[PDB]
Amino acid sequence: PMEEEEVETFAFQAEIAQLMSLIINTFYSNKEIFLRELISNSSDALDKIRYETLTDPSKLDSGKELHINLIPNKQDRTLTIVDTGIGMTKADLINNLGTIAKSGTKAFMEALQAGADISMIGQFGVGFYSAYLVAEKVTVITKHNDDEQYAWESSAGGSFTVRTDTGEPMGRGTKVILHLKEDQTEYLEERRIKEIVKKHSQFIGYPITLFVE
Known part of the structure; x- marks a missing residue:
């Protein structure tokens, strides 16, 4: 018979929701920043796992x-960004960069002592939301070793849903699926992608691969 997947609906925090409204309902010229910020999330996520392995190497099972993979789908009108980083936990998903702000990243304190550098965008509620400059809806599927695989998703409107993902398991890492707006079909070209990544993501200490259909 059918299975009833567990679902959970939350609302964006007041100022975040208004910011979401601002982004979508206002025209911006330099939309291309979306890729730079999203890549930063992936690299930072890779830095998280990089530092995990020095103190606990068994996290590498x-x-x-450690790489970033870009998968454009010209037929679906989707741009998929996948990384093999630390992945996100149910806590990190809901307490994302935006919900927790001006509180101080707790992990950063002990990570600093472990020899970690400042490369963990987990508080600044601005970078991640750049996805809505090009996409109408973004879904983020992630799994962390210490947690299950979850799917976060929202079409703005002030609300977002989270659910346990029964789909394809990535093992570890982050999968962000951007549903680009109809007027944003330019970012489905392999040339346009390279244009942005070379320019904005040139100083990435990890391999970047674009899968061109």
Whole structure:
């Protein structure tokens, strides 16, 4: 018979929701920043796992490769960004960069002592939301070794849903699926992608691969 997947609906915090409204209902010229910020999330996520392995190498069972993969789908009108980073936990998903702000990143304190550098955008509620400059809806599927695989999703409107993901398991890392707006079909070209990544993501200490259909 059918299975009833568990679902949970939350609302964006007041100022975040208004920011979401601002982004979508206002025209911006330099929309291309979306890729730079999203790549930063992936690299920072890779830095998280990078530092995990020095103190606990067994976290690499779910994957040792550290890279960013771009998968454009010209037929679906979707741009998929996948990384093999630390992945996100149910806590990190809901307490994302935006909900927790001006509170101070707790992990950063102990991470600093472990020898970690400042490369963890987990508080600044601005970078991640750049996805809505090009996409109408973004879904983020992630799994962290210490947690299950979850799917976060929202079409703005002040609300967002989270659910346990029964789909394809990535092992470890982050999968962000951007549903680009109809007027944003330019970012489905392999050339346009390279244009942005070379320019904005040139100083990435990890391999970047674009899968061109």
